Amino acid sequence: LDSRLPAFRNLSPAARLDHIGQLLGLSHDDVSLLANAGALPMDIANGMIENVIGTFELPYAVASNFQINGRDVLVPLVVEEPSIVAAASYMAKLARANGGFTTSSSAPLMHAQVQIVGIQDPLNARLSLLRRKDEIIELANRKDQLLNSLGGGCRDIEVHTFADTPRGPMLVAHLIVDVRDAMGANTVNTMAEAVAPLMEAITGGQVRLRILSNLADLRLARAQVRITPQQLETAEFSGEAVIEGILDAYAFAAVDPYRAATHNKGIMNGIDPLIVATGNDWRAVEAGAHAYACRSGHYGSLTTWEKDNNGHLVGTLEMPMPVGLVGGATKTHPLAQLSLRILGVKTAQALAEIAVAVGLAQNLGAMRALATE
Amino acid sequence: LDSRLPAFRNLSPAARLDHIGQLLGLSHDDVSLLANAGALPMDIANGMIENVIGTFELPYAVASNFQINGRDVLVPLVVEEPSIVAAASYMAKLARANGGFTTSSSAPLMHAQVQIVGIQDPLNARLSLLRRKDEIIELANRKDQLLNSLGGGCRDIEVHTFADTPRGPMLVAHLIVDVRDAMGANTVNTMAEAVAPLMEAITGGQVRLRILSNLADLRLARAQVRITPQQLETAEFSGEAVIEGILDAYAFAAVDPYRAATHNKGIMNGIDPLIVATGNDWRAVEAGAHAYACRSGHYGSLTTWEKDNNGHLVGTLEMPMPVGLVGGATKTHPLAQLSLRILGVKTAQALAEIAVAVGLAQNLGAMRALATEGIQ
Numbered sequence A: 001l002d003s004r005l006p007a008f009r010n011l012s013p014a015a016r017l018d019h020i021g022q023l024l025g026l027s028h029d030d031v032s033l034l035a036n037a038g039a040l041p042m043d044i045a046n047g048m049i050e051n052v053i054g055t056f057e058l059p060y061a062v063a064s065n066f067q068i069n070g071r072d073v074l075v076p077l078v079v080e081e082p083s084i085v086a087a088a089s090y091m092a093k094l095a096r097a098n099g100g101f102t103t104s105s106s107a108p109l110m111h112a113q114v115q116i117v118g119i120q121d122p123l124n125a126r127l128s129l130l131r132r133k134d135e136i137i138e139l140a141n142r143k144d145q146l147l148n149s150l151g152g153g154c155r156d157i158e159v160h161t162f163a164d165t166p167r168g169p170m171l172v173a174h175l176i177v178d179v180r181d182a183m184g185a186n187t188v189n190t191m192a193e194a195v196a197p198l199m200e201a202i203t204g205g206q207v208r209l210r211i212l213s214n215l216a217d218l219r220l221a222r223a224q225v226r227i228t229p230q231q232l233e234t235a236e237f238s239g240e241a242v243i244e245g246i247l248d249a250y251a252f253a254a255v256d257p258y259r260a261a262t263h264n265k266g267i268m269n270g271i272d273p274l275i276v277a278t279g280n281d282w283r284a285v286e287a288g289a290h291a292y293a294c295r296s297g298h299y300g301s302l303t304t305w306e307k308d309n310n311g312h313l314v315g316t317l318e319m320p321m322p323v324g325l326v327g328g329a330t331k332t333h334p335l336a337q338l339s340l341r342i343l344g345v346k347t348a349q350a351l352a353e354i355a356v357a358v359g360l361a362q363n364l365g366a367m368r369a370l371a372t373e
Numbered sequence B: 001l002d003s004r005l006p007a008f009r010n011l012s013p014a015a016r017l018d019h020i021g022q023l024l025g026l027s028h029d030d031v032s033l034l035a036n037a038g039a040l041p042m043d044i045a046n047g048m049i050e051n052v053i054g055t056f057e058l059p060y061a062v063a064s065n066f067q068i069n070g071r072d073v074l075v076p077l078v079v080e081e082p083s084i085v086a087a088a089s090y091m092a093k094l095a096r097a098n099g100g101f102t103t104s105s106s107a108p109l110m111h112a113q114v115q116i117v118g119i120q121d122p123l124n125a126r127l128s129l130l131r132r133k134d135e136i137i138e139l140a141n142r143k144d145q146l147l148n149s150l151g152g153g154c155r156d157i158e159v160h161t162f163a164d165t166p167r168g169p170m171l172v173a174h175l176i177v178d179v180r181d182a183m184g185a186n187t188v189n190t191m192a193e194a195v196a197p198l199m200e201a202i203t204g205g206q207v208r209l210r211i212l213s214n215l216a217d218l219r220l221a222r223a224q225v226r227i228t229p230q231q232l233e234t235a236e237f238s239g240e241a242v243i244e245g246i247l248d249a250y251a252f253a254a255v256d257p258y259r260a261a262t263h264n265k266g267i268m269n270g271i272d273p274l275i276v277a278t279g280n281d282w283r284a285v286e287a288g289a290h291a292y293a294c295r296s297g298h299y300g301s302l303t304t305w306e307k308d309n310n311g312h313l314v315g316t317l318e319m320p321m322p323v324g325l326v327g328g329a330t331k332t333h334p335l336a337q338l339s340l341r342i343l344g345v346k347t348a349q350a351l352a353e354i355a356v357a358v359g360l361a362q363n364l365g366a367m368r369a370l371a372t373e374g375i376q
């Protein structure tokens, strides 16, 4: 695949679609899903959420130029705000000259929290749970034998205590679960329910909340980009000056939460539209992103920007990225399925890696604009 | 208006739309917007964002039972996830018995940041700016006198310094701007560009970034809700026990960021779909929400939950809520316009107040469900 698409921004929607269809070898019927309104039929919409009276459209666009680990990728995006798609495509174009985006990710690990109350000895109870961790993990896995056959499953437990809260002592167990190609909520919640009676028997306490954590800090996706001074030169500014300007902008975000919020918002401008396009839960991605940004006790920037030993601008984005190819609405929405086909992703972590690449590209575009104005 | 909508959940989408139309007295044109697919014309969609190849639908629903400061309101919501609309509606139903939701909000005040570098004396330059505050404010208000006449405009400036960063000393001025019915990005960005040469002249430094802050902590919206033990009783638990369970869940969110992230995610399950339904920018609302949640140096719960002196469960939500009735897709999307018609909102702050009421209801619904689920 070649993702460049010259003159794409100036073609009509119909011509853009026909071009995409030809590039990907989409069927006439697949193309029909975008060529005509109503790809989400009312019986599907009515079964997705409650009190439905119709559907609501946002534009469906494709960003060009993206290249991930040497392979060109076309990126569908659904959003209402101008400039996002153009900035994504243009920054991807610059990235291409220097090898594109380089990405990696952790295993798709999610936390299931099991909150325990009603015991006077939470610190002791924690050791009781750890002593019997194998038994707990085995019980969790008995509950989802298919997942284990697919290469996922409960891998570990960790246990945290809050001995002094205004509501008394609490213990919180985390199941650490490989969820393969799911976002993971229903998967881990089910395991949390399954282990609850055993945890009560072990601790002598009362289980309260059984629920995933959206602070998915064991499910990280990583992206790198490199830009040379030559690429950033303007009529007004030399490329070296622009790079220094960008580093100044980054330092500003790193110290001032008023700037970091806006800086990170820019990243999410790139990410959320891909989440929507793939039928994924954007609230979950947002919560993981912003909570991770303040894990140090200070709300800072999700990206980093530096100058390497060669004087080149180098950027990173590492953040939680819980997304699915299966589960939720990723299967139910015919256009979510088409998006996955366009992307060509075969695992959820592959989708996660594309997400962070697009987030990094958007942040680069935002700061290049702010540093050159 | 009566927002109770009996049996709404079980009616057909067509019958639901008819009942809404009757209640609001919607025109034929308005009803036809939702009855046929493709309400967003491709010409409009193509002008909204770049590289458009089609459109993407999400379900469009209406939450029932909401009441804001004694007035019933219907709430449109666009989202993919089940249980949200039902939970919102059911919690709103319970809220009604005790006076519904009570809301307030600050003026629609947004920050424009002006970053200045390369000053050898940033602390001194800060005082130079403050001495000439009125002069700066006057210049900011020069271009848009329509905004001033509508009761908006630059109200104040604050100046902050970061004298020791790895890239040298930085001075950051904030223009504090009343943006009336806009989210405010265009308004404040324009003012920030306008005052920049004057700030350079005063400080002797170089202006770099001129940009709104999404941490809109001067644009707060507030909601309150009250629920009695009687309303929360289940087959297994007394209402009193359920209230204690909810308070335990709240304390858990207040101490553990792994819980707080999920707890706040639930709030945003309520809010974001209303933001989408009104053509507004949900990334802006998300960033303001979560950054505000950590302002104290610990990422905590946006809501609060307490038991009052009568033993009633009382909840609050106060958070940044920058939204518009004008600008971009809010204007150009026919269904964003329909959503505003359904809501009946006359100011952006009124929309903000409904947003926090829905966020508060959603959090309550989530905690109630988690607190009442039996151990298997």
Ligand SMILES: C[C@@](O)(CCS)CC(=O)O
Pocket: A262, A263, A264, A265, A266, A267, A269, A366, A367, B211
């Ligand atoms: C340009 C930006 O505000 C997003 C526009 S909605 C992000 C940033 O400031 O870095």
Ligand SMILES: C[C@@](O)(CCS)CC(=O)O
Pocket: A211, B081, B262, B263, B264, B265, B266, B267, B269, B366, B367
């Ligand atoms: C139930 C909840 O996870 C949202 C479902 S997406 C929120 C919460 O845990 O309070």
